[PDB]
Every structure is written in C-alpha cells, then in structure tokens.
Symmetry: C2
Amino acid sequence: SGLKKMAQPSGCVERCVVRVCYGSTVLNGVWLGDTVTCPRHVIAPSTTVLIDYDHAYSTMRLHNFSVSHNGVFLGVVGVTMHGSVLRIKVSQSNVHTPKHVFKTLKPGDSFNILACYEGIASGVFGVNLRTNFTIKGSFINGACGSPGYNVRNDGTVEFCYLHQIELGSGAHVGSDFTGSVYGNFDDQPSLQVESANLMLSDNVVAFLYAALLNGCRWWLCSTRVNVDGFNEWAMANGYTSVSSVECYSILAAKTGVSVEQLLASIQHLHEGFGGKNILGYSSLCDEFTLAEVVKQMYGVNL
Amino acid sequence: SGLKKMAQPSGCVERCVVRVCYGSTVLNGVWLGDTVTCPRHVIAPSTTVLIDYDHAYSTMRLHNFSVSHNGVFLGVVGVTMHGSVLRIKVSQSNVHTPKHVFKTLKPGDSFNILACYEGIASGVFGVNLRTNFTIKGSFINGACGSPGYNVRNDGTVEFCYLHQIELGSGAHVGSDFTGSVYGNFDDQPSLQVESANLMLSDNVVAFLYAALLNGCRWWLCSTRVNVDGFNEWAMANGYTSVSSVECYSILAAKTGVSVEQLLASIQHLHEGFGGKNILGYSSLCDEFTLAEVVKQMYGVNL
C-alpha cells in the first residue's frame, strides 16, 4: 500500500545526458544516436538585451562547442537550429541509446524530470504538465536542458521535455525535442506570465478512488450529477473537465462507487474539508493519474 | 527556484538489482562484488503460521535458488544467514559494482528507495526515516528486497535499506545490509504495530526556510519562542526537540528570519493549514533535512 509520487528509473536516460558548452556558457543536452539535442540558449551572447537567435546562429562557429559525456569529449560535425533547440551532429553514436521515440506532452500528462547540472544528473522526480503548459519543479542555475521522459509499458523511452526557463512567477517552462516551447512561451528572459492553473479533475477522481480503497469514505456525496453537469461546474470553479468514465472501471468495480458519485463528491469537497483529511491531504489532490493509482495499488497497466 | 522531494538518480543502483527466486517465491536482491544480499523471506515456506527461520535455513537446498540479472544467470555457490538477510555467494562478480559502503540510518535521515519487482526497478522516490524506524513508501507484493541508498558527494553509494515488510498499519519496515531490522520489528507477518512517530522539528524548520526562500510566507508568525520554550511544548505535542539554532545561520541570514520566529510559527500551525498549503503540502512537512534543502536550493553543503 501507499501512494507516493515517484519517478520511473533514470538509468537509461542518465546514459544519454551530456554537457554542452559554447564559449563560457554551459548547459545540458541529450545524446541519442549521433545527435545531441539541447536548448539554443547555449549560443546566446552575454547581454541583458533581447537575444536575436537568428544572428547568434549565423555567427556561430563550430570550434567554440565542446560536448562531453562523463568527461569524454565528442567531435562536433554540424549544428542546426529548430525552434528553441539545437541539433548537434556529433562524430560518433551513443552506443547506449535506448529504444525511444519523441512525444509532445498534453496538459494532464505525467512525466519524469531528470534534473542535471554540467551534464551530470542530480535528481529525478515525477511531475504533471499543467493546463497552463508549465510545471512546478525545482531547478537552479545550470539546469537548462534537463530532460523529461516517460517509459512506455513496452520499454520504449518517450523523450518529451527539455528544460528552458523559469518565469518571473517561478513557473517552469520547457520545449519538446522539436524545439516547440510548451505554451508558446519565449525561451529567453521576458515578462510573460502563465495562465491560472486548473485542477486536473481526472487525477482528483483517481485520488478519491485510492482513498476509498484505503477505507476513507467520510466525504462521499449522494447528490446526482452527470459528466456534462460536472464539466459545466468545473469551468465555473477552476477545474478541468473529466475526460471520460469507463477507464475507471477497475476502480469503480473494486469500490462499488461510480465516477459520477465521485464527481458529486468533488463538488461538495470544494466547499471545504471542515478540518478533516483524505489520506493526509487537507484539500483535494490532483497529483496522481489514474494510471499511477492503478500501477501503485495493483501493479498493472490500464 | 522551487522545492520538491526528489530521488537521487538510480542508474548505479539499477545495475546491482537482481531477481532472487527460491522455489516459487520471488523477490529482489542486491549484487555487489560476488555477493547477493536479499531478505531471508525468500526461503520461507508457504504458510500462514509462524515461520521458524532457523529451521528454514537448516533445510535450505542451494539447487532451489535461481538468481539472475537481466537474463544473466548467476550460479549460487553458497548461502549464509545474517539476521533478517541472506548473503548469497555467486559465481560471478558484478563488474558494475559502484564505489560503496554500508550505512545504518538514524531517524531523520533522508534516503532513496528503488522499488523493484522480480529484480526489475519500477520506481524511485525519496523518503525520510521516521522516529519509529519506519518509512512511508509505496510498495505492493513482490517489493521485498527493494534497496534504499544515498549517494555521497564523492560518489560513494551508501547502501542503507532493504525492504522487508508492510505492517497492518501500512507502515514500511526494512533492514540494513547487516541484517538488523530497523526498529527491531519482526520480518514476518504479525500483529505488530509501530509506535507513534514524532514530527522531526529540525526538518520542519528547514522546510519553512525553504518556503520563505520560495516566497511563501502567509504562515509566518509575528512572535517568537525560544528553544527551551519550544522544546517543552514539543514534549507535550508529539514533536522532537530542537537542539541548536546555529546550523540554520546560513538560511536565517538569507531570509532575515530567526529560528525562534519559525518555532513560534510551528506552534501556530501544528494542527493544520485549513485549505491552504506550503510548497504543495497540506500540513507541516518533516521530510526534508537542512542539508537536503541547502543542496537542492543552492547546490552547496553545510
């Protein structure tokens, strides 16, 4: 038993992290096959003024790069720029490249972040992409290029995130491996601000099922609500729509409680917990996905 | 910025996890040099009655073991029993044994768990050893033998925990690599219940400093209480004593807030936040050490 936000193991991703340096600027990259992908920030000139990346790219010289894995330097063959990332062709392939694909996350998706500094991983944690296209992680100077990944049920690594910048608000912004910044934020300092976060209803439903399976049921509500009604309430109260109901069948069967009864319970609990808690939480928890709850409680995939 | 409970990267430990089978029973072991350490539960008979491990060990037959790392079959040369673990000598040394030591944890220590099933890692998360010598993890059937570790600055891996059992209460119990069970709980099913844990005051102070440094200060009390005063209050309210304000000097300086002001805040907050949160937590958090907070937020040591 227990429900804890965890990361999928990081070994296969650690073996792909590299240190990328251009002039004095250092950040992290990901080495897959004969290509290193990293944020284009690495070629920015030192200045406080707006960076013109097209000009930075045109004045770029290959000899200014150094790329290394565990202190072993790689030859740089060529560099191209794609959105907010660089693709650096190197002169040998990573022999420890995992079976992998590239995936662009959608809000509500869980993934793992490997926080790296100077091409060496320091921490790994699970995180959710928020409705405002940011995450809440923990990064300090040098974390740029820290990768996000998921490992599919079949073992394939999905590469989905490269850390780009922290907004003034503290929100964390990354791009996918194609260079598209999640939420269309600028990949350089600015005054941009993310939209207000919405609670992930699908995850709250999963959380309440976990609570029921632990004998915590004081909060169950007997009012009638359907998905359409809940979704209208959600829009008015800072919650996402619930996506669907049937996917919860494994948990609905184990508990005898329908998703619609949980939706009614969310509406009630919005009023307050009146000093009580659910699995130790004093407010609704949207940290855990359905997949996570089923995996952690029953050891199976959906 | 940010503060998030993370795990240290798991790669070097994944390379030491093996599948250990005895008869139909499968669990996890840790392969270092030519020895695999695993919980002695692996040789228990299938029963609901009390297990006599001395008898089980006396009747053990080496041929019944199957030990493997990723399809690499390891020949069993001999087995000895030490407290709650077996040391299985195998015919091959793990050439990926990391620089390591064995370390016995004390309450308040943070470490990492690699949750494994059938010799394969599934998740990694950080935990903190409670005053009752249990942890709050997430484990289901098959997790026995999942290792806990901490990586020192010089890269030395401290192997500190092997998962043993979940109590009826849900608390998680493990042993060290010498075979001593943390808290001296029984390593088989029983009606044992862990003693009540105390909130780790030193860790809460570290957490509140982290909150301040991340701009979260709604909870900050306007008054102060001295260490002696807090300590008398703590004894009556299920908190550990705070010993010295001096170790907090660096964060007190960065924030302009004294430990005494944080201690007064704790007293006001010890029953909950209502519906509010601090760094995503519904109530006071004692999961982070001072060293952990400083390392994560400033990349330095104490």
